[PDB]
Design a protein around this ligand. Structure first.
Ligand SMILES: [Mg+2]
Length: 336
């Protein structure tokens, strides 16, 4: 069907004719969304800048201060960075008509929106770890990582070099005491730390590592369609889900193109294309496909086992010096 964007916003977006996106969403996953939006609105030519979460922040802030040509729309899994920008005057306020049922903890009033509910999962190479061998608990994974065969065979986030690796491992540390025991097992097994999903996945695919902890269900699902040896396990003791935040650049050259794309992302049509075709874990619970809330809830044993990190100014507490220090000091000691 068609997103409910105001007719005058559609006309204004046609007058602009262009959309510059800075996004952390790997273009392999985002591409079907771009294709489908272009079908809907063929008079908009999309520039997709596939960038790291930190590079998106640094570049946008830098370009804004220079007064330069920057993005129309920012889309990133680094939830703290997005909520910081959107709460500091970088955001165009827009009441998306596709968000009327968005929970208040899934939006920053009209300044920024959740676009997904993406689980941090375990992926593994079935040539080296059989499904029956991969625990679904932090305590279980801590036990597996005592085995001599797992030494140098574990991949996870570097939370000091990836802003979303921070978001995910911070939420994990805050919510699950058993994360402490697991982090020490990352030490024991001499886990390697990566700043992107792609770099962790390529090591699991080659067998250089057997297991990767905390990377996006979305990317795991998509990579499985081409790599039959890739397995996915969901955490039954509790799953962290990020919500990819989209907001519009207050100083966008193409504010209405950005509005149409944000509406598209939040719409039934865009959320179903996420769930079904892009294999991005959708935010709306009324979707069909592999990458849905209902599939996530089923795999982990209930919606109550999922900690969805809120799209809230309260999460800026993770950028407080004292808060950052306690987590990174614990982490560094544990994993070296
Ligand atoms: Mg990416």
């Amino acid at each position: 069907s068609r997103p409910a964007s105001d007719p005058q916003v559609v006309e204004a977006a046609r007058k602009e004719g262009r959309l510059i996106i800075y996004s952390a969403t790997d273009q392999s996953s985002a591409q079907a969304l771009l294709d489908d939006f272009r079908k809907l609105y063929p008079f908009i030519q999309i520039e997709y800048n596939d960038l790291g979460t930190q590079a998106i922040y640094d570049r946008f802030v830098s370009e804004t201060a220079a007064g330069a040509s920057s993005a129309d729309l920012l889309w990133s899994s680094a939830m703290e960075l997005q909520v910081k920008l959107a709460s500091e005057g970088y955001a165009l306020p827009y009441d998306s008509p596709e968000a009327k049922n968005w929970p208040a903890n899934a939006r920053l009033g009209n300044l920024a929106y959740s676009t997904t509910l993406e689980p941090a999962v375990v992926v593994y190479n079935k040539r080296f770890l059989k499904p029956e061998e991969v625990p679904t608990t932090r305590e279980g994974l801590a036990r597996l990582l005592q085995e001599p065969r797992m030494r140098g065979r574990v991949a996870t986030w570097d939370p000091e070099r990836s802003a979303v690796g921070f978001t995910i491992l911070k939420a994990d540390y805050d919510r699950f005491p058993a994360f402490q025991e697991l982090a020490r097992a990352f030490g024991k097994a001499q886990a390697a730390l990566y700043s992107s999903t792609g770099a962790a996945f390529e090591k699991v695919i080659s067998g250089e590592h057997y297991l990767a902890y905390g990377f996006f269900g979305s990317y795991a699902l998509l990579r499985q369609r081409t790599v039959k040896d890739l397995g996915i396990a969901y955490l039954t003791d509790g799953t962290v889900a990020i919500q990819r935040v989209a907001f519009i650049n207050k100083r966008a050259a193409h504010p209405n193109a950005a509005k149409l794309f944000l509406d598209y992302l939040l719409s039934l049509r865009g959320q179903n294309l996420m769930a079904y075709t892009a294999l991005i874990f959708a935010r709306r619970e009324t979707v069909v496909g592999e990458a849905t809330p209902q599939a996530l809830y089923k795999a982990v044993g209930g919606k109550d086992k999922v900690y969805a990190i809120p799209v809230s100014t309260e999460i800026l507490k993770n950028l407080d010096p004292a808060e950052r220090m306690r987590f990174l000091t614990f982490w560094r000691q544990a994993v070296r």
